[PDB]
Design a protein around this ligand. Sequence first.
Ligand code: CLA
Ligand code: CLA
Ligand code: CLA
Ligand code: CLA
Ligand SMILES: CC1=C(/C=C/C(C)=C/C=C/C(C)=C/C=C/C=C(C)/C=C/C=C(C)/C=C/C2=C(C)CCCC2(C)C)C(C)(C)CCC1
Ligand code: SF4
Ligand code: SF4
Ligand code: SF4
Lengths: 62, 74, 80, 74, 739, 161, 72, 139
Amino acid sequence: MVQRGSKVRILRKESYWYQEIGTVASIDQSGIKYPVIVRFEKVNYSNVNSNNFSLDEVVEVE
Amino acid sequence: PGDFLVHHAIALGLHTTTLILVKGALDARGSKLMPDKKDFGYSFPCDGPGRGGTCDISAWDAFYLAVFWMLNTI
Amino acid sequence: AHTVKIYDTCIGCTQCVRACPTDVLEMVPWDGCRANQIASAPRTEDCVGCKRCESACPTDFLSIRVYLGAETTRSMGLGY
Amino acid sequence: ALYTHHQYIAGFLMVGAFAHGAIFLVRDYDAEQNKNNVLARIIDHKEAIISHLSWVSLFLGFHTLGLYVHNDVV
Amino acid sequence: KIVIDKDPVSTSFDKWAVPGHFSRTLAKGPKTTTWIWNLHADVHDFDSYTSDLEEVSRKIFSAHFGHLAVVFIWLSGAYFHGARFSNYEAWLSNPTTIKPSAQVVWPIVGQEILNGDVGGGFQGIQITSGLFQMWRASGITTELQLYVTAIGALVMAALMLFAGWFHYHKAAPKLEWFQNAESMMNHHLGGLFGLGSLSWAGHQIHVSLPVNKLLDSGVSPQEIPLPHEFILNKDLIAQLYPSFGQGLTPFFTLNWNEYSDFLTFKGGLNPVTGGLWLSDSAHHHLAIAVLFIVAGHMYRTNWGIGHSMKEMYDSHKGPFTGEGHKGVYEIFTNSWHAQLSLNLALFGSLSIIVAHHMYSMPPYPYLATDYATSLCLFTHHVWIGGFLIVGAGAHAAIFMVRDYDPAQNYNNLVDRVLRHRDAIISHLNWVCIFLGFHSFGLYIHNDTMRALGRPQDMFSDAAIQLQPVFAQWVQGVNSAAAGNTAPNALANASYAFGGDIVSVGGKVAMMPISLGTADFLVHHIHAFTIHVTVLILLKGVLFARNSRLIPDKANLGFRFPCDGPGRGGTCQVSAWDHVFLGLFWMYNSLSVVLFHFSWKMQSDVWGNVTADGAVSHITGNNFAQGAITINGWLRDFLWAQASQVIQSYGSALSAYGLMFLGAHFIWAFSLMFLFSGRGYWQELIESIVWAHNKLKFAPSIQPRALSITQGRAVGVAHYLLGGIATTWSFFHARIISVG
Amino acid sequence: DVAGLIPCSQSDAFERRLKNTTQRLENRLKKYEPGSAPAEALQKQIDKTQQRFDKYRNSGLLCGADGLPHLITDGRWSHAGEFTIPGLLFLYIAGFIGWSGRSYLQAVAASDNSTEKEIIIDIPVALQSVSKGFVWPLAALQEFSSGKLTARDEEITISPR
Amino acid sequence: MFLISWRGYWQELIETLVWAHERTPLANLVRWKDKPVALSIVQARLVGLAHFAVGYIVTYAAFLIASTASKF
Amino acid sequence: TLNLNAPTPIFGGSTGGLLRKAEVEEFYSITWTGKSETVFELPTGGAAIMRAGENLLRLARKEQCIALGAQLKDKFKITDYKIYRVYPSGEVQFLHPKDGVFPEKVNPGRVAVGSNKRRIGQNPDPAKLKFKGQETFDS
Ligand code: CLA
Ligand code: CLA
Ligand code: CLA
Ligand code: CLA
Ligand SMILES: CC1=C(/C=C/C(C)=C/C=C/C(C)=C/C=C/C=C(C)/C=C/C=C(C)/C=C/C2=C(C)CCCC2(C)C)C(C)(C)CCC1
Ligand code: SF4
Ligand code: SF4
Ligand code: SF4
């Protein structure tokens, strides 16, 4: 289980941040899919820093 | 001496020409700027002004730049 | 006409719908939570493929995707 | 005439060879039937090969052009 | 009324550490590497961030003072280098053989052959800017005078830069002071333009006219008295043109004909020097003085009388124009961009007139026959002149997106131009294509009939003639005007229309430039490429807000790269891309004007005259039967006259031959940016920033590609730099050798 | 005697440059004053060609039939000063430019906000960063053996396939 | 021309030509069967490159042959 | 219902609008009510005047009747506009707002046409649909 304030790696292979370190922001503790809001140090192409990931998509490098 | 420099220019040309073609081919299925590139086929105009701009992002466009290098090498 | 697909990563932000210059997209009620909304493309026959929509989705990799298809008088924006 | 004609054709064929190869990668290459063979092992480290290929072009060009301009001024 | 805010912003070095402090989104920090290019574009784009029409104007009023400073620094750089590192004092002894030289090279790794055997006792680079003939015209005899000007400019350089501080950081004016255009025209015509030529008349009579009349006799540069001695000594000046013994007393009883000796209407070329008679230019600037001073008492101020421009534009309206100029005064007080476009057009177009009126009426002594310089002030001011017109097309489009208002402008002339903008462009489109067929296609016809060996079928003088009868009737009636319609002129306005030749030294100052079938053929190419450069630039201004294709091009901004591949593709729909496109066409428009000019003079006009009386020109009258085809344009102009620029190695021209290759390099480099796009070069960063992440040293500012417009802008900026500096090097190392 | 060039201390090829350098400039110097300021720029100039040629006669250069010293990089120690010793001079400075930014961008990225610190070049970090770049032929050898020079290929961002 | 100037510029120009045709008598009478539109984005790259390539060869072919056939 | 003819705004101009396509296939129209006498830039050139109205203007395409509304609602605060696409030579009247409410807002009863229940890398490969008529991006 992943809680807020953790450092992750990325298995979403369709992303820009794929296999990069993200420090998460929040989990939506209701049933809406892809709830892991992961802030990153690096910014993407279209200038966003955070993204919804799945709990099956984030890791626990800690 | 003249033959030395030119022989390295042709080498420079042969390395640069294959580079353009290989980058186009190995990134054809996808890259960070366009992860789902393979879904649009070999040749498409671009992907709009979003994500910074994507003109000349297709593998066909990659071949196209390498053609210029081919005339230059020969 | 162009094909406009909406993937399940939509966060119901409504940015896309308000970006379309020909009103091809709309937000519709989602049933996975009955509180959020997902975009839909009921009028893809009017999509010109300008891609203004995809430039409005905030998610790291698009929830709405435009795959250029068969061209028509409407999609080419001809006033003539 | 004989050297130029056949040399220009050779440049076209080789660039064309990579062009039809790129079409294969987008429309025919299946990763789900190509796992750990010689092919799929290469494009695993696809960013490494291109980055090295980028250097060789940069390396060759900077110095060879540099010598010509050096020679040119003097 | 003069209303001021006192010190709105003080003197702080603290904002110098934050770049982008002027803006909003860039006073936060970079996250990609485009933020540098996002910064460095919109620095001096003052209404991009500022919303305050008064505060955006106070920045512009300050920054002009700084631009006034940097010319004064650059002027002093000409004036300083004119004394120490020039052969100027030696050149006044002998103006015919010694070439004007400045910018001496330091004795280092091999550039000390650029200090060639130029003349005098001197070694330097032969310059072609004409400061020597501008200082010989100004009356400069000693080299001390060039020194004190430079410090005299440098203190004005410092005084201008302090004044930009004084009027923004100390005393900022308000918008009601700025909007007083009528009082501004009164002074700028009165003070700047009226007393401009009057003060130069005040210079040229008391200073330039004595010491340049003596140097026509040519006693000595040392034996000419100093310029202040012609005001002190009353007898010394009245030896020559002796009206100064009568003093100002004929000027004050309205008996002005007593100054028929220095304030004259000679009107030719001074045959010893080949330049305009400085007596005439004294009378010129005196007539310009009174004409501009009475031009400056015209507009309304706080003394009741005058013409007010909001009253004049109203009731200039006709039945084919509706409201006429209603509100057009309200544009040019409310929009800097509308002002800059009109200020730029008549500033570049003015300079092309300067280039035309300086080779046919050479103003300066020993500038005419010095072919190194009389060419290079044509082609420079032409080149400046085209860049300002493209800037005139740019800020005209910027007015349309951001400043134009359809609320005020109902049914008036910007409304009725925008409401028929297809009829303008499509008739302009036709006359572009009509001109390309009937000018350029007359060369392709002429190429083939020479290639097929049918010179009875080409368009030539000994063939199907295309005679310029309008430009020969105009050249006739202007050459037969001294005595019929201009009686008090001794000779004509110039010797370029008609008359005898003139020689200085052994070289021709001026001779009648003749216009035959080959001159008709090139003058329509100029008319073609100007109409296309109009067509690109006019369409950018007119369709800047909307079109049939996009109805909200005004919302997407002036400078946006495309609207995507929709509607078949909308790459380069913006007004900025029209200015980007017109830049090459202005490169094409002007470079053929120079190719017309620099070839017509060498074959027909310039050359060496015998002491028998006839002239053998340089490239030998080949412009008649050679200039009608492209192969003659390629062989007998481009291939033949570049024989001296690539054979420049080992001589003092060898820096030009490097640049003639060096500009061939950059021009090729620009093709990489115009022919490519962003989404290729972005994904080569992704493999390379992989490799810089691979060895654990990756930059926190992540690299991205250049923006598409910046890919476009660097593609044109290296194109022009590669193309003009080729022509800059070709024109130099041609005419320095054969002239 | 490796590619068909005489050691050009004995060559008639390298010497047929010296006369038409010094005769071009003496014919540029003949019409001057012997006490002029360009004259010392044309007397010292031939001396600048004179120190150059008497540096080349002694160094053992291989000059062809043209009189141009050609270079031989197969690197033998008989011709090692041509390329190899200016090669080692290059690479030792190149890693000093190599490791300085490498040690800087490790030292500012391990801080709060390094995105500003690419704009501002921090002398509290940059003089600290060249101090790590001076031991660069020794530091990187114990950085690869300790593994902290590179990273594994799931740390480095991978474009999709 | 095709490689440097892109579609948008031309498509907007073409619309003014379409307008002009539809509003000029003795021409109105006739009509196109296919509506005119600017070349596509990819097409222009292809057409531009093809011109660039043909010119490259025909310039070098003309030069190579003629240069040798006078001096050998 | 179009109410043709509704009184057009007093204009007189524009070479750039409603040419021969409108008299062979599918022209457009937009209806709104002007709450002043203010002036606005048309997609053709710029001015008309907003009437009291009943304000109709036969524009060229769909994009111009949508971009007018995004210009009307911001500048003149009028969100009553009711676009059309015509009778006999056109296809569907009342193209926007299709629900009566603005379709940037969400509303019960709409249909989710063109939804893919996946991610985009989770689309099938075009190597997997070789000589198969199933679209790669389609469910
Ligand atoms: C020899 C084997 C071979 C075969 C069987 C093919 C076959 C094909 N190729 Mg491939 N290819 C080849 C070699 C081959 N090519 C070479 C040598 C190159 C490099 C030049 C390429 C690069 C390439 C690319 C990038 C693409 C193809 C594509 C195609 C497909 C469609 C081509 C088409 O109709 O586009 C239209 C054809 C043209 C526009 C050709 C006309 C151009 C003319 C010949 C230029 C001549 C200029 C002018 C007319 C000369 C006038 C005279 C002058 C001298 C004065 C077809 C399957 C396309 C595809 O999608 O495959 C699925 C595709 O995108 N080819
Ligand atoms: C009469 C003086 C004048 C003034 C005050 C302006 C002012 C402006 N112009 Mg305008 N314009 C002018 C003349 C002028 N222009 C001319 C002569 C041209 C033709 C080139 C233009 C064409 C033009 C375009 C196309 C655009 C502007 C824009 C602007 C605005 C921002 C520009 C900026 O901040 O650049 C900051 C300075 C730079 C970015 C310098 C970069 C280097 C430049 C590109 C080339 C320099 C080459 C160099 C001199 C050659 C030597 C090479 C060597 C140094 C290596 C600003 C209002 C921009 C705008 O958006 O307005 C709203 C814009 O897009 N101008
Ligand atoms: C009225 C136009 C006009 C003309 C034709 C001249 C002509 C001349 N000036 Mg003078 N001058 C003028 C006004 C003019 N002046 C004004 C207003 C000032 C104050 C800014 C000066 C300050 C001045 C100085 C300090 C010097 C000269 C010098 C000269 C001579 C050198 C060549 C040259 O400048 O290019 C010719 C320029 C043009 C053809 C463009 C004219 C630009 C003005 C602003 C046009 C005004 C518009 C006018 C009402 C309509 C004409 C439109 C178009 C046909 C020009 C030449 C006789 C130099 C000299 O003494 O040589 C011996 C010199 O050192 N001038
Ligand atoms: C030399 C290369 C070249 C040529 C020939 C053209 C040609 C043209 N440009 Mg282009 N342009 C070029 C380079 C070139 N451009 C480049 C490099 C750029 C990038 C900056 C552009 C950017 C540009 C823009 C922005 C615009 C143009 C426009 C035009 C057209 C202008 C009107 C005209 O003259 O029609 C007449 C055509 C000619 C003179 C072409 C030569 C025709 C020959 C002489 C006759 C044909 C012989 C024979 C009958 C041919 C068929 C034989 C066969 C059937 C047997 C013309 C077709 C403009 C336009 O479209 O305006 C309407 C325009 O706005 N161009
Ligand atoms: C001379 C000689 C010799 C040698 C030989 C050799 C060893 C050679 C080599 C050679 C080689 C070694 C060759 C190579 C070449 C190759 C090429 C030809 C390439 C191509 C490739 C390609 C084309 C690729 C591409 C692709 C990709 C990338 C992906 C997938 C697909 C494809 C496959 C398409 C000897 C010793 C006997 C002796 C003496 C003589
Ligand atoms: S940048 Fe140009 S080529 Fe690329 S998608 Fe946008 S409009 Fe098309
Ligand atoms: S498609 Fe994009 S803009 Fe629309 S709701 Fe989903 S995430 Fe938001
Ligand atoms: S491609 Fe353009 S028109 Fe089509 S839905 Fe997206 S934004 Fe709207």
